[PDB]
Amino acid sequence: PETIAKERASAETYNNNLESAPILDPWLESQRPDTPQYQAYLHEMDIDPVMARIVIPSIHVSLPIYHGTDSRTLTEGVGHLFGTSLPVGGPSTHSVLTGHTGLSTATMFDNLNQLKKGDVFYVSSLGQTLKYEVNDITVVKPEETDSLRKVPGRDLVTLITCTPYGVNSHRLLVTGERVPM
Ligand SMILES: [Ca+2]
Ligand SMILES: [Ca+2]
């Protein structure tokens, strides 16, 4: 501090050099990938072991966010989807945050299905709190991934979980859009 300013500018550079690609379901793969790009990614937002924090007050979710969506990570908190924008907000960014439903030994994102449009969440990281407002809710098949892609000149975050409870045949996608306070 403020070396947290360097970390943020690098994060924003990351988002801006981020190249559109296929984003696979978070639950397809259970292991950490092993690639040079993934290692490069591990270096972003790495001051603390927690990448960021999310609070969805109206469903009492207050959780840490970590790099990746391997099975160990999602047992520990909200996992961030490698391939999507880092959660530092800003333009032409779409950050995808992943959380279990049904783990039982931890609630995680069980109650994502109580959210509706106009509901609010906040993503804090690198000294800065981002307010998002929910403006799209949508159930979907695991392979149906198109809606996790960058939407240009928009600042979006999607919370994704499995649904329905105990069956996980689909995915629930709650998308919020950046709102200034
Ligand atoms: Ca760094
Ligand atoms: Ca995964």
Side-chain angles (χ1 to χ4, degrees), residues 23-29 41 51 54 56 61 63-71 73-84 87 95-101 107-110 112 148 157-162 171-174:
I23 10 181
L24 289 261
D25 183 67
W27 293 264
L28 186 74
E29 187 42 23
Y41 156 81
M51 152 179 329
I54 180 165
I56 311 157
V61 158
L63 295 167
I65 296 170
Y66 300 103
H67 288 86
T69 55
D70 57 286
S71 73
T73 294
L74 302 197
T75 277
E76 284 314 293
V78 173
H80 170 259
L81 193 51
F82 174 68
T84 68
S95 197
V96 171
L97 307 186
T98 315
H100 278 319
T101 283
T107 305
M108 298 312 185
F109 274 178
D110 277 353
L112 219 55
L148 305 178
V157 167
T158 302
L159 314 177
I160 181 172
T161 186
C162 290
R171 302 309 181 240
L172 162 75
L173 308 214
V174 164

Side-chain angles (χ1 to χ4, degrees), residues 1-130:
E2 191 91 344
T3 140
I4 119 181
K6 282 166 282 170
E7 277 272 12
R8 186 172 203 100
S10 176
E12 319 213 31
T13 290
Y14 183 96
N15 293 333
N16 291 327
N17 282 121
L18 197 61
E19 72 310 299
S20 43
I23 10 181
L24 289 261
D25 183 67
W27 293 264
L28 186 74
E29 187 42 23
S30 78
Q31 298 272 55
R32 293 172 51 250
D34 163 26
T35 85
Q37 305 76 203
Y38 189 74
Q39 287 307 133
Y41 156 81
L42 257 33
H43 271 108
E44 301 291 348
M45 307 190 76
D46 80 320
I47 306 174
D48 298 313
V50 171
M51 152 179 329
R53 288 215 138 251
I54 180 165
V55 55
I56 311 157
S58 71
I59 54 156
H60 310 281
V61 158
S62 177
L63 295 167
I65 296 170
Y66 300 103
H67 288 86
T69 55
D70 57 286
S71 73
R72 287 122 294 258
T73 294
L74 302 197
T75 277
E76 284 314 293
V78 173
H80 170 259
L81 193 51
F82 174 68
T84 68
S85 312
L86 301 178
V88 281
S92 300
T93 70
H94 190 183
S95 197
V96 171
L97 307 186
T98 315
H100 278 319
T101 283
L103 186 64
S104 192
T105 60
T107 305
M108 298 312 185
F109 274 178
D110 277 353
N111 305 314
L112 219 55
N113 57 18
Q114 297 177 200
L115 286 190
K116 67 269 297 294
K117 296 176 205 223
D119 273 336
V120 133
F121 59 93
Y122 302 91
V123 181
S124 296
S125 69
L126 279 15
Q128 197 161 316
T129 296
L130 315 186

Side-chain angles (χ1 to χ4, degrees), residues 130-145:
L130 315 186
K131 182 180 188 189
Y132 296 83
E133 177 184 49
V134 174
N135 73 10
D136 198 17
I137 311 193
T138 287
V139 169
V140 128
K141 284 179 189 57
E143 56 281 339
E144 293 174 23
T145 252

